[PDB]
C-alpha cells in the first residue's frame, strides 16, 4: 500500500533493486570461480562492465520465457558475448532468486534494526523527562495505585529493547544465501564456490540446502516483525486511552488553529490496524515452511506479498511511533488532577491497614472504610475528610497519621532502582 | 485433548501442580523477606511445614471469593496460624501467577528441549546410517536429479538442530517473573524481596513489571513453539508422500500379520494436523500483547487454553516423530529403482551438456535429446539405448563417454563434505 | 477448559456421548436396510435392546486396535450375537464418524441458537427501556454528537440478529451425512439406505462424498461462530469502555458490601479473551479443507480440539453477556451529565453553521468558533456564557436562537424512525 | 502484487474507480433531497455536469487536507459554483467512504459470481467426460478401493456450486450503505434522503449505523471468500498429486517442445500459496469487528490491503483454476493401468468377504488372503494367479467365482445415481 512507503525501505523493493540484487549474486559467483581458478582470468571485470539491468528487455523475454531468472541471465546473455559461458554457471534459478531474498531480508532487517535504535533511544529521553510525573495506574480500566509516567513509559522501552535483541537474532537466521544448483547437493556447482561467492555478499551457506534455503528462517523472520508489530500496538493502545476526552492525559502530534476538542488520535488508531496485518503475515508464513521434498514453488506468491508488504509496514510502524512518543504533549498537571478524580479512594488500601495495625481485624476496618467509601462516592465531600469525622477513625490515629497515608510519595519510592536497571 | 497428552508434560499443568507452584513462590518470597531481616527469624519454616496442598479446601473457598489466588492464600492462612501476617506480604495476584506460569513454561521448555535433542540425535544416527543411499531428489514433485537419502534426513537434522537453539532462547525469554505488587512499582513490596525471592525459584526480575509480565516474552516463546511444530509437520509430509503406494520408499512404524498393501501413514497425518493447532495458537497469544494500561485480563482465558495445550501438543509431537523416524523402514532398493522410473531420462541435462561440448550449438543438441526423450517416454526401451543408436549422437561421443554420463556417483560427489559442516 | 463449560453443551462433547451417537447412525442404518429388505425383519429392535454403551470396554478394545470405531464395532459385536453380521454392514468408519459429528453440530448448532435468540430478546429488551436515554456518541475515543443509549443497544441487537439468521445458515450447512462406503461410491452400501438412514437422523445426504464429509462445511460453521464471538467481543469492549472510572456510565453484575471504586469489568474481559480463541480456530478449520485424494486423517486431531471448544466456548460466551446484558447497571444521570464534560463544545458545529447562515463565511464563523472553544477548554465558563458575551455573534443571533442550537433534542429526532425499522 | 491482476477486477480497485464512487454516492444523495423538495430542482443535473474526477487536484489538496473524502469534496466544490451548499450535505466522511465500499463489494462479488458459474460450467463438462473413466480412490495416499475419474471431479463441482450459494449470500451482507451522518442518528441528514439515495444505487440502509457500517459484515464476506479459496487449493493439491512422476494421471496445460518428464505442476502451486494469503486475511477481518464506540479507524488500514487484494486474488485464483481444469490433459489409459499397480490387491476385501460367505470365519480368511497378499507384494505374479493355485480357495470357490471378484463394474454401479443429483 502506496501510502505507507518511506524511503530507505521502499527503494529496496523495486523490481530494479531486485535485479540488481540477482546481477549481484551472479558476479560474486563468477568472482569466485575465478578466484578458485576454474574458469579463465578476467571474466568477472568484463561482466562486470557489460552487464547492465534493463528491466524492459528481461520483462519482455520473461513473456516469452515465462520464468524471471532465465529471461534475466538470457538478457546479460545477450550483453556479455562469449562470457555467457561461465556466467550462471551450474546454477539453479533458486541460488539467485534466495540469495538475493536473503540480501534483501538483511538489508530491510538493518534499516528497521537502526529505526528501532532510534526509537529506543527516544522512549529513553521521554521516560527520563517525565520519571518522576506522578500519574494513576490503572488496572481493567479502573484506577488502582498511583506510580510514574515516567516508569510507564521506561515500560515500552524495555520491550523496544528486547525487540532490538530479537531482531538481531532475526537478521542473523535470514544471513544465509544457497549456491547449491538444483537439489542443492552441489552436483553442478562446488561447495567451494558456494563459500566464496556467500562471503563476498556478506552471507553464510545454508549448512544444508534442498532447491531452496528452509522456510523456517523466514518464518522466524516475520514472527519476530510481529512481535515487534505489537509492542507498537501496545503503547499506541494506551495512547487512544489517554487521549480519550475522559481523560486526557496525552495528546499525539498532528497537523499544524485547530479545535481543542476534537483531537483525534487517528495516527494510534492507523498503528493499531497495520499490527493487526503484520500478524497477519505470520501464518501464511508458517504454512510456507512445509514444502513438498526438495521443494514447491507455492511459498513464491505469498513471499511476493508478505516480504515487502512486512518489511515496508514496519518501517512505517516504527518511524512514526517515534515521531508520536517524541511529539506528543504530555499533560503532567491533569496526570496529578486524575489521581483525585475519585476524592483520595485510591488511599483506601492504606487506611484499611492502618486501622487493622492499630487493632481492628480485617472485617472491622474494611466496614469503616467502605461504609467512608461510599459516602465519599456519592458526594463532593473527600474520603480524608470523611475519615477524620468519623469517631472511630479519630480513636485510633492522629490526623497527622492518617494525613500522610494520602502522600503519593509512598508509590514513587522505588521509581530510581527501576531506572537504574537500564544503565546497566 | 487427553488422548495426546503423555507424562513428565501432562504432570506439569494438573490443579495439584499449579497450587504447588502458587505455595513455591510465596515460600520464596517469605525466604526473601527473613533473609533480608523484614520479617521475623522461623517465619518461613514454619509456613513450610504447616502449608500442605488441598485442591478440595481451595476450590471450596473460590466458590466464595471468585478469585483463585485470594482463595489460595485464605486456604492456606487457616493453617499457617499468626504466621499469615507475613504470607503473601505486599503482593498482587499475578506476582504469584505469573510468576508461577513462568516457573511452567520454563519446566515445559526444559522437557520440550531434552526431547528435541534426542529427536537431534536419532535424526544424525538415520543420516549417518544412509548417507550413501541414493534417492530421486524431486521438485515440484517431478524426478529431478539424483542425491542421497542420508542427506534429505540430515536436511531435517539441521532443521531441528535450528529448532534447539530457538527454543534455547525462548526459555530464556520465559525465565523472568514478577514480585513487583499491584501496579508493578514496589509501593507495596520491595524490590530487595523480588530480586532474592526470584533468584530462589531460578528466575529472573522483569527489568520493569506492570501489575503483569509484559506478554510479548509468551508470544515468542509460542511461535518459536510453532516454528518447532512446522518443521516436523515437514518431515511428516515427506513420510506421507514416500509412502504412497506408488513410491513406497518407506513405512512409518506400526501396531505390531498386516496387510502389505493397506500401510497408511496415519501418525504422519496426525502429526500434519497437530501442526495446524501449534500454529493457530500464535495468532491469540499475540493479539494478548495490547492489554490496556497495567493490565487487564483477557489473556488470563486465553492462556488456559494455550500454554497447557501448546506444550504438551508440542512435547507428543517431538516423541511421536522421534519413534518414527528411529523406527520407519527405509527401503533402500526401491529408493534406487526408482530413480530409473525415467528410464534414464534424469540425466537429461547432462547429455545435452556433453552434445553442446562436443561442438553442437544449445538448440541443436537440445532436439536430440527431445526427439530420444520423448521416444523413451512412450515405450519400454531406455534413453541410453536410443541415444547409443542415434546417428548424431554416435559422431559426437563414444560410448563409453555417453555411458559414463549416466553414472549416479556424480550427483554424490560432495556429500561428505555437506557432513563434516556437522562436525563442526 | 472445564472452567468454562456448561449445562447442555458440555453433555454434548462426553465419551458416553459420541459412542450414543455412533450407535444411532448404526441403528438408523439397520433400520434402512431392514425397510428395504435387505436384511432379516426384526434385526434392528434386537440390536436396539442389546447395544449397550460401555465406555471401559471399547477403551480397552481399543488399546488393542489402536482404531476407536473399530473397537466400538467389535464391542457392540460381543451384545448381539448372530445379529452382528448385519451391524455396519458395508460401512467404513468415516460413515459412522462423519455422520455422528453432523449430529453433533447440528445438535450445538440449536443450543447455541436458542441461547442466542435469548440473547436478542434481552437486548431489545434493554434497548428499549433506554430508547430515549441520552448519551454522548464517542467517535476515535473523543465525544462527537449526543445520542441515545437505547440506540447504541439496539446496533448490538442489529449484530445479534444477523448472527441468528447466520447461525441458521451454517446449521443448514453441517446437516449432511454420509453413508456411502470406503470412497463415497456406494460400491459396499447402497445409496438408498444412505438416503433412508440419514433421513430417520434429520440429515441429507452429501450428494458426493469421498470417503469423508468435505471439509468445506465445517470451516463455514466455525467461521460463523467466530463472527458470532467478534460480534460478543464489540459489546465486551464497550462495556470494559463505560465502566472506566473516568467514564462509568454502566457496570457489569458482579459478586452479591463491596467497595464503590473498585469495580472492575473482569466478566467483559474474559469474554474478549475467549472470543480470540473463537477467531483462532478458523485458520485451521480452513486449512483441513485441502484433503488428499478421497481422504487424509490429518483434520481428525484439529476436529478434537475444534469441535467441543468452538461450541462450548460461544455457548459459554452468549449465556454469559446475555446476564451481563440482563443485569448490568445503567447510570442515565451519568451518561446525561458526561454529555457536558467539554461544557457545550458538542454543540459547535451547529453553531458554525448558524454564524455561516447568517452571513458569514466558512472562515470567518471558525475563527469565532475555535476563539470561544479556545477559552471554554482553558477554563470553567461554559461555551454558550462566551458565546453569548461575544459581540460578533450577539450582532448575528439572538439569544434564544443561539440557546435552542444546545438542544439534545435535535439529535435523538430520529430515533424512533430507527426503531421502527426492527417492528412487527 | 500486480502480478496476480487481471481485467475487470483489477479496475475496479484503482484511486480514479474510488472517486468515482464517491461521486456516484454524492450524486445519490442530491438526487435524493432534489426528489424530497429539500434543495432547488436541477441541482443534481448541473452538479453530473460539472464534477469531473481530477485525481492529481484531489491528491494535492489532500496534502494540505490530510483527509482524503475533506480534500475531494473542496476539489468537486470548486467545480460546481453555488451548487457546492447543496453537495455533501450533512454527511460525514464515513457516509461516502463505506457506501463506496459497499459498491465495491458487490461489484467485485458480482465478477466473482460470475467467474465462479463459468468453473462450474467447465468442472460439470469435464465431470460428464470422464463419467465413467475407472481411476484407482486413495486414501492416506494408499490405494484404496476403484472408483471414477468423473466422480472425482464432480466432488469439486458440488463444492463450487456451494461457493456459488455462499457467494450469493455474501454479497448481499454487504450490499448495505449507510446516509446517516456523524454518528448515525439521522440529526444532519435525513432518514428518507438515505434510503431514497441507496435505492438508486441497489444497495440498502443499514438498519441501524454508528458512524460506520457494522464491519461483521466485511468479515463474513471475506471469510466465505476465503473458504472458496480453500476449495481451489483442494483442487490444486490434488492435481499436484495426480502430475508426480510416479502417478503421471494428469497434466495442468502448459507453455506451448517441451521435455516430456519435467511438466511440472506449478500453476497448482502458485494457486496453494495464493490460498494461504486468502486465509490470512480472514483473522485481520475478524479483528476489525471490535470497534470502539461509533468507531475508531484502525480497519482502515487493513482494508486498505484486504478489500482490493482479496478480491483480485480470488478472481485470479478462480480464472486460472478454470484454464487448469478445461486444457488440462486426462491419461485415461494411465489412469486404468494404476489400479493395478498392486496386481490385484485392491479386490482383496472382496476375496476375504467370499471366503467367509463360503463357510470360514473372519480369521481364517483373513489368514488365506494375508499369505496370498504377501507373496504377491514381494513378487512379480498377480494376487488372483496365487489364489487360483491356493488349494483352499480351490476347494470353496470357482474359478468364474474368483475371477468376478476382480470386476471394477463392482465399483462403478452407483456412478449414475449420484450424477443424477446434480440433474435438471
Request: no cysteine.
Given at each position: 500500500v502506496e501510502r505507507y512507503s518511506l524511503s530507505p525501505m521502499k527503494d529496496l523493493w523495486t523490481e530494479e533493486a531486485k535485479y540488481r540484487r540477482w546481477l549481484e549474486v551472479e558476479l560474486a559467483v563468477t568472482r569466485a570461480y575465478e578466484e578458485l581458478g576454474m574458469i579463465p582470468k578476467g571474466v568477472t571485470e568484463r561482466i562486470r562492465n557489460n552487464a547492465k539491468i534493463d528491466v524492459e528487455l528481461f520483462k519482455k523475454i520473461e513473456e516469452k520465457t515465462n520464468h524471471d531468472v532465465v529471461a534475466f541471465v538470457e538478457g546479460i546473455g545477450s550483453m556479455i558475448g562469449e562470457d555467457?559461458?561461465?556466467?550462471?554457471?551450474?546454477?539453479?534459478?533458486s541460488d539467485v532468486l534466495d540469495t538475493a531474498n536473503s540480501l534483501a531480508l538483511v538489508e530491510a532487517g538493518k534499516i528497521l534494526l537502526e529505526s528501532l535504535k532510534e526509537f529506543c533511544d527516544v522512549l529513553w529521553e521521554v521516560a527520563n523527562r517525565y520519571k518522576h510525573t506522578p500519574t494513576?495506574?490503572?488496572?481493567?480500566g479502573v484506577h488502582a495505585e498511583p506510580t510514574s509516567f515516567g516508569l510507564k513509559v521506561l515500560g515500552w522501552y524495555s520491550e523496544m529493547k528486547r525487540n532490538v535483541q530479537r531482531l538481531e537474532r532475526a537478521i542473523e537466521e535470514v544471513s544465509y544465501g544457497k549456491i547449491s544448483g538444483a537439489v542443492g547437493n552441489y552436483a553442478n556447482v562446488p561447495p567451494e564456490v558456494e563459500e566464496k561467492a556467500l562471503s563476498y555478499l556478506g552471507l553464510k551457506p545454508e549448512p544444508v540446502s534442498t532447491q531452496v534455503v528452509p522456510r523456517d528462517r523466514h518464518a522466524f523472520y516475520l514472527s519476530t516483525l510481529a512481535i515487534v508489530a505489537a509492542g507498537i500496538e501496545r503503547i499506541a493502545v494506551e495512547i487512544r486511552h489517554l487521549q480519550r476526552t475522559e481523560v486526557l492525559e496525552v495528546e499525539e502530534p498532528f497537523r499544524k488553529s485547530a479545535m481543542p476538542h476534537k483531537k483525534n488520535p487517528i495516527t494510534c488508531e492507523r498503528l493499531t490496524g497495520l499490527s493487526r496485518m503484520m500478524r497477519a503475515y505470520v501464518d501464511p508464513s508458517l504454512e510456507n515452511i512445509a514444502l513438498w521434498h526438495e521443494r514447491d514453488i507455492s511459498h513464491s506468491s505469498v513471499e511476493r506479498y508478505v516480504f515487502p508488504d512486512a518489511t515496508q509496514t514496519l518501517y512505517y510502524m516504527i518511524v512514526t511511533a517515534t515521531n508520536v512518543v517524541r511529539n506528543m504533549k504530555v499533560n503532567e498537571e491533569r496526570m496529578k488532577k486524575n489521581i483525585d478524580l475519585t476524592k483520595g479512594l485510591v488511599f483506601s488500601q492504606r487506611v484499611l491497614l492502618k486501622l487493622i495495625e492499630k487493632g481492628l481485624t480485617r472485617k472491622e476496618a474494611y466496614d469503616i472504610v467502605q461504609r467512608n467509601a461510599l459516602k465519599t462516592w456519592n458526594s463532593e465531600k473527600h474520603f480524608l475528610e470523611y475519615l477524620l469525622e468519623d469517631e472511630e477513625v479519630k480513636?485510633?490515629?492522629?490526623?497527622?497519621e492518617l494525613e500522610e497515608l494520602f502522600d503519593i510519595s509512598y508509590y514513587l519510592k522505588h521509581v530510581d532502582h527501576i531506572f537504574e536497571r537500564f544503565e546497566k
Open positions: 555467457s559461458r561461465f556466467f550462471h554457471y551450474g546454477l539453479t534459478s494513576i495506574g490503572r488496572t481493567h480513636k485510633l490515629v492522629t490526623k497527622e
